[model samples]
Target chain A: KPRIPVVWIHGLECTCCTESFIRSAHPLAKDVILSLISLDYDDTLMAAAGTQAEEVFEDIITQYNGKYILAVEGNPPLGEQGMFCISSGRPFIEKLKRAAAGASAIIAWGTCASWGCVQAARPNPTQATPIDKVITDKPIIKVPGCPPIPDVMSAIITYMVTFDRLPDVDRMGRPLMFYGQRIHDKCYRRAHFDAGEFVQSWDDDAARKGYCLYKMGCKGPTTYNACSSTRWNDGVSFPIQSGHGCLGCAENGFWDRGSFYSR
Target chain B: KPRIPVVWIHGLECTCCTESFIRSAHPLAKDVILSLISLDYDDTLMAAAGTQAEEVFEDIITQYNGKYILAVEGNPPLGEQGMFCISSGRPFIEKLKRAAAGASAIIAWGTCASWGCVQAARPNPTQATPIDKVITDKPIIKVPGCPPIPDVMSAIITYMVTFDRLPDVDRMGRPLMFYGQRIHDKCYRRAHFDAGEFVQSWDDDAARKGYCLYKMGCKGPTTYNACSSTRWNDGVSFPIQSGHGCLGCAENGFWDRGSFYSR
Candidate 1:
């Protein structure tokens, strides 16, 4: 069977999603593109440029039509007819909508595209909007995170390729397998939490002894993500395990929270 | 002028340590029984009892040694000489060595003596003994309920009696102040536990919904006595809130590991 084609589109983003995605494990990007999905066009990774790159996207759309996957990496700004971010002199939002029109499924690739990330933090300028706000006609899978976990990104793609469908999502359109439990649920220092032994300050005796960080304004109890379980750097350690607390980057409006350590 | 007398002891324990003591909010029970140490004669709660209970314990002891407080709570076997229990009975391992020898403190209210709760669970029947074992010593306070809420039992007697010492404890030895934290750390699902999100089976939907359960194995994830914050009541919500299904960590042996949900 011919593999499905996947086109990754970029908008107003830091490209951290791309950074995390390349580190995926199962059905890795190389495997997914080479075996499951035909390599299409991704400006960041693709070796095309100028009008030819534009032509490649146009060609993929015409040839694949409703069989392709439209993966968007950031939100579109709508304040000035999408003037805030443009691709080849045209509004990216329009490009996103047009590309999404014939897509079999749309995957909002990061907190930026999925939940407006820092671009939409509180007093958002440019009127940035999540992809869901602009395109609601199709089945959308939101992979939210400041830049989501690598394996999660890989898993979502693998699940889609192997099962030919998106996995179950929570009310916010996030996958259940990954976002189902809070980070606090799997934390190692939970015993200290139960014992009321919390670290009052950084470098304190409690911190030296590896006590719970609740008192230091950790948002683990309320945030949901697989950082503690899957970890970063090939399952070695996450922010909390490394002695710093979670800033709840995966949650909405985390950027405007004043200080990340202030809860 | 005189410091109120106080005694302390233990029972079936991981012991967590007589280690948690230096951290007490109310360190000595004598601070609670100063006013009426003269009236009580508990071997653990008071300074006078038995031969000592009258004169040596009450009059002579208070005049010569000063009024005292008692504290004890451990299981004793009831065989032959009931040798396993004997306090003032010779061969038996009595707290009498500590309480009976010219002391004025008495307290016997931990799970062992107050209930014979764990030591007596499904056994051949030595008819395990309680603190009343060596009544030849002094009057005792009876603070029942395994380990007992530390603060509830501590604060109760601390405030009730305006003594140069701690207040009078019950025959069980527990004070009432510290044990008052409640099974609710202001429980998030008290409404659920009250309305019922009980886990009918091991991993049922109710468990996912975070429900209440007089029916489920929740013991508020409720056995009152400060589990909510003082949490085993330390500072965090107890087991049920953490999603593990509470094994009643504070209850006696809460070790035999039977079904907490079973009646």
Candidate 2:
């Protein structure tokens, strides 16, 4: 099995991206790729911790350096000398740069690392910024989702290690394969939206009737992600299944945009 | 406007069916019913309570015997001599039987009443049973989503009242108009599945590309419902559209058949 050295990092946000990635639904995806296909260096997934973990991170950057993949989850908080988020007792912004300098490619794992999620919302005191904004040297592929679809994560890794190339990306640096179309373009409920059917209120008859949730402030149209197609939790259900609307977590300014539940 | 006296009975349910029903996307179906259309005794939605509500329920049946529509939202627990659920201080089964006795037709609102949802899943402690089992004599029309899509609930009601007859039904008694095809038949992602592309994990490039979720055990191929066409929340989105698999919420024995996530 071909092994591509990988350096996975976390910055300023939730760990759901990592959480979603590990639970890949493919039969042996987790077992195969994670164990053999690529050399993973995730702080949360790997065994080493504290000083030992720091050494592994430092050792890999030099050992593989320019040949490695830098996978960044979350974003960097640059306020107060990047004080909001700390890694190995140093500001995360500095650490992210050190890792990206020699990396062949950078994979922005989730909305936070790619688009600066809630941490960068309005009045973002932490001044959390996306990796692409900070790292100007390497080519970056933005996998923008609240946490992204798990299958998409593994596919990206496999595509890299097997094909020995980065996946095609769209104008915004998001992979063209997943981020090309708006959720509304292929939404199952697009028919309803086309018919001008919408839910009026939470308790009104239209709501119970399963009317369109656009009136309730769904952001599926403007946002881009594999969510409408890839789903979550082993493809069992997403928020919409429980009768809710999209939060547009895959977009760049998800937090500052608008209310998650209301327009 | 012609109004048909109706009595909606609850056996054992989450009231999600009721929640879905009231939200019918159609313009008149919801408004037409909230004030007057066909509703005579829906204890859950009605303002009247105590014996007054019971008196109205009983009175409606007397006035429209063998003419009123009996809409059942859930199943009845036959265990403990029908003790799991109680309506109007008596075993709810008694209320259900009384309502069914005089109704011209019965509309099983959701999976609970149509196929016995979670309450009737494996080792059902309450011995919760579908309404058809309890009301053998009635010509039942099963609208079997977990909480049947709102438009479907309304459409079924309209077809019944407009034609003064039941809609065409398949062997399972579901309205052929709504349950005629599998979600996969018209799935927007059908092209992806046909193209042999699937999301292997949440973060795979294929997921970002909006590939099919067949490998995730999507029940779209076998599950039948109007979700792909009629949609939910006025057609905002459905489970499959939101990047998740069908829970087979409309199918019988879904909970016990297999894991919702596994093939």
Candidate 2 — which residues are off by over 4 angstroms? A27-29, A32-36, A261-263, B1-263
Find the 10 residues in a row with the least total lDDT in model 2 chain B.
Answer: B27-36
DockQ of each: 0.02, 0.09
Candidate 1 lDDT tens digits, A109-226: 8899888998798788889999988998988988888899988898888788789888999998989888887777656556567669788988998876556788787888778887
lDDT of 2 by residue, A146-216 (tens): 88888788777767766878999998898877777776655555535655778767867666555567898
When summed lDDT is taken over every stretch of 10 residues in candidate 1 chain A, the lowest stretch is: A228-237
Write the residue-wise lDDT of candidate 1 on B156-237 in tens digits.
Answer: 4455345545554323344443433335432334534433446676557876655554465656434434444344332324
Q: Candidate 1 at residue A117, lDDT?
A: 94
> What's model 1's lDDT at B146?
56
Candidate 2 docking: what grade?
incorrect
TM-score of each: 0.52, 0.56
